[PDB]
């Protein structure tokens, strides 16, 4: 009716947005009942990068973790993948949006990180750009470990182990079941004939560099079996060094 | 009477943590309590303002909420879980909550039992 004329107007605002106070109709989108119909009129694919940051800034604050997750999954995350493929580097506002998306870590992990690695088509460049934001923003220990467990159980790709390393790089105290998944993750390549990248060894390095205190003799010697079958001229002696100078409990 | 009064509470708190049912602090302790979703109230005996205490007692009096009184708030920091822990399990962040308001319980056979017994002895 008349509401369709209001949002078709703001469609032409958000497509040419750069700065300033947004129209008040846009700021009350997650308060609506039929919000997904409204969002399609505004045309999220035709939006400017600057608009995308303030769009994310709205959804992260207005509660509802389930409503927040589905915005990232349908609008935000495709746009990130669209620009890394096109411009090869990410836009500033689009980057700033992702840091603002971490105000709800539950909706972040279930909407951005986990769906990205599950697709399989995730490139190395895509992984580092998003993964650096994990290093910048502090994440709750419960949510940090929960994302870490999924990636450990997940199918292996080059992009996948980058995230896993950066989560261990945070150096939080870990739940014990997560450690069991991480050991089982790396020991899954013990019989593998495939040539493993350097980023894989660095992930195994960071695991032993920090969490050598929480490794029992059973899994500790299972790791020494892993390096004996899948070696590296540079990094494998360092992991061998870190295991031999480890004090348990 | 297998478990004690100052032992079974940890289980209640732990279950609440697990099941997302802890309204700690001051405003979350109050605004959820008047929303009749919150079931219990725990208070610190060590206090700076008696007005706060009075308010708490009023809150407990109105919606028939049982009041538990623990000695120090700094002790309750261990009970709630507002401490940042090391790899071994060492606290380095010392913050203690004066009010611990319980929203949800875990379906327990011991803690809930002992606590129930305590309640029925009280009232």
């Amino acid at each position: 009716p008349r509401v369709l004329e209001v949002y078709r107007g703001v469609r032409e605002v958000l497509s040419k947005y750069r700065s300033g106070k947004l129209p008040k109709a846009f700021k009350i989108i997650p308060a609506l009942s039929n919000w997904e119909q409204i969002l399609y009129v505004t045309e999220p694919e035709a939006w400017t990068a600057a608009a995308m940051y303030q769009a994310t800034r709205i959804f992260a604050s207005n509660l509802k973790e389930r409503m927040a997750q589905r915005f990232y999954n349908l609008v935000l995350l495709p746009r990130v993948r669209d620009d890394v493929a096109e411009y090869k580097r990410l836009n500033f506002h689009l980057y700033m949006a992702l840091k603002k998306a971490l105000f709800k870590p539950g909706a972040w992990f279930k909407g951005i990180l986990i769906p990205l690695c599950e697709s399989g088509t995730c490139t190395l460049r895509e992984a580092i750009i998003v993964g650096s934001i994990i290093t910048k923003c502090s994440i709750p220990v419960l949510h940090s470990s929960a994302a870490m467990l999924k990636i450990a159980e997940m199918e292996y790709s080059g992009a996948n182990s980058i995230f896993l390393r950066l989560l261990l790089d945070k150096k939080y105290a870990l739940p014990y079941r997560v450690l069991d998944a991480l050991v089982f993750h790396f020991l899954g390549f013990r019989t593998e004939k495939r040539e493993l990248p350097v980023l894989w060894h660095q992930c195994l390095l960071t695991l032993v560099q920090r969490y050598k205190a929480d490794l029992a003799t059973d899994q500790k010697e299972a790791l020494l079996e892993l390096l004996r079958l899948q070696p590296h001229p540079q990094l494998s002696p360092e992991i061998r060094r870190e295991l031999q100078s480890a004090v348990p409990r | 009477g297998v478990m004690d009064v100052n032992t079974a509470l940890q289980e209640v708190l732990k279950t609440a943590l697990i099941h997302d049912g802890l309204a700690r602090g001051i405003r979350e302790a109050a605004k959820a309590l008047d929303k009749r979703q919150a079931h219990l109230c725990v208070l610190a005996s060590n206090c700076d303002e008696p007005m706060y205490v009075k308010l708490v007692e009023a809150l407990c009096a109105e919606h028939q909420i049982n009041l538990i009184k623990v000695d120090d708030n700094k002790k309750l920091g261990e009970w709630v879980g507002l401490c940042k822990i090391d790899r071994e399990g060492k606290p380095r962040k010392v913050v203690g909550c004066s009010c611990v308001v319980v929203k949800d319980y875990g379906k327990e056979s011991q803690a809930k039992d002992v606590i129930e017994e305590y309640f029925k002895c009280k009232k």
């Binding site: 419960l142 470990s145 929960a146 467990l149 105290a173 739940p175 014990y176 079941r177 997560v178 450690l179 069991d180 998944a181 050991v183 089982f184 929480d214 029992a216 059973d218 899994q219 299972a222 348990p248 409990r249 | 732990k14 697990i18 879980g81 822990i85 399990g89």
Partner: peptide, 18 residues
């Protein structure tokens, strides 16, 4: 669920994965 586990000393948090 894995085979080789935590073995010894302390269980601070139970963790919610579900």
């Amino acid at each position: 669920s894995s085979v080789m586990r935590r073995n010894e000393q302390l269980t601070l948090h139970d963790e919610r994965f579900e």
